[PDB]
Amino acid sequence: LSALNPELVQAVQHVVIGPSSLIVHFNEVIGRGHFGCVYHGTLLDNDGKKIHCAVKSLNRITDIGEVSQFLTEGIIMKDFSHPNVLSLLGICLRSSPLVVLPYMKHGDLRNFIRNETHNPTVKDLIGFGLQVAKGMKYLASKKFVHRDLAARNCMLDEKFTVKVADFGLARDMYDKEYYSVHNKTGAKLPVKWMALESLQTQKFTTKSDVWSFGVLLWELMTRGAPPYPDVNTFDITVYLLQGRRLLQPEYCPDPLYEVMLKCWHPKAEMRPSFSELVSRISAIFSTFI
Ligand SMILES: CN1CCC(COc2cnc(-c3cccc(Cn4nc(-c5cccc(C#N)c5)ccc4=O)c3)nc2)CC1
DSSP: OTTSOHHHHHHHGGGBOOGGGEEEEEEEEEEEETTEEEEEEEEEOTTOOEEEEEEEEOOOOOSHHHHHHHHHHHHHHHTOOBTTBOOOOEEEOOOOOEEEEEOOTTOBHHHHHHOTTOOOOHHHHHHHHHHHHHHHHHHHHTTOOOSOOOGGGEEEOTTOOEEEOSOGGGOOOSSGGGOEEOTTTOOEEOGGGSOHHHHHHOOOOHHHHHHHHHHHHHHHHTTSOOSSTTSOGGGHHHHHHTTOOOOOOTTOOHHHHHHHHHHTOSSGGGSOOHHHHHHHHHHHHHTOO
């Protein structure tokens, strides 16, 4: 890493965590991304109080340009903050590079809602959706496009707070079943969560994140059923163009299905904003015991 531009190193210094502040348990994988496994560790604060971390080791870096990009992105991502978006705690360089993230005790949202020993109420599930909407309202306000919003890509902490995750230095494929390669460009695409226009052009916007959010709501209301199980990946674009959409789940309230449907409008500009979604979903949430 002595090949890095020294001004970049100085610019990222405030994101860097020294090895003597970290204790990582590399003997046990706690999560798996295509581009790296995740391990538990602890970060020592200024008192020596332990902060629990998920530490991710990036696995296919080959050139200093990639590292430089990673550091540049880290500076941007470090200064994001919202209670429903995952924080970047820092990067450890003097230990491959380690991305240091807050530990998420209850794992990804899709696994949480599929846990048969727990019974989230309908209200709880809608509340998870509301929390995601609030995190996305924040990302949208930063002009940041997620591109891979899905229940598998959101996390829950010890207070059951939902964090939009899988972005910035945490971006990866954490369940490879749902990504398909596009020939023309080599992009790995989460096809069954994508907006029609993104399927046609491979371009993404905040309004395509709104489409994905509608799919995530459907995931919540089905307790983690896979969307369009009988539609092959390569047939989803046509399925949508034919005027077909995911069906209303049995226990999805009518006003929430209406929200879903608006998120899947064929014209991006006609989909609700995340600000509108927070408002409307907060009303729906409030009507349940
Ligand atoms: C029973 N089980 C025992 C282990 C418990 C704690 O394990 C943890 C695992 N991972 C983290 C962690 C924290 C912050 C950031 C990330 C990275 N990241 N990962 C995912 C992710 C992780 C695992 C599976 C799937 C899928 N599909 C997706 C999504 C988005 C994202 O950004 C990981 N924290 C704790 C959970 C309950």
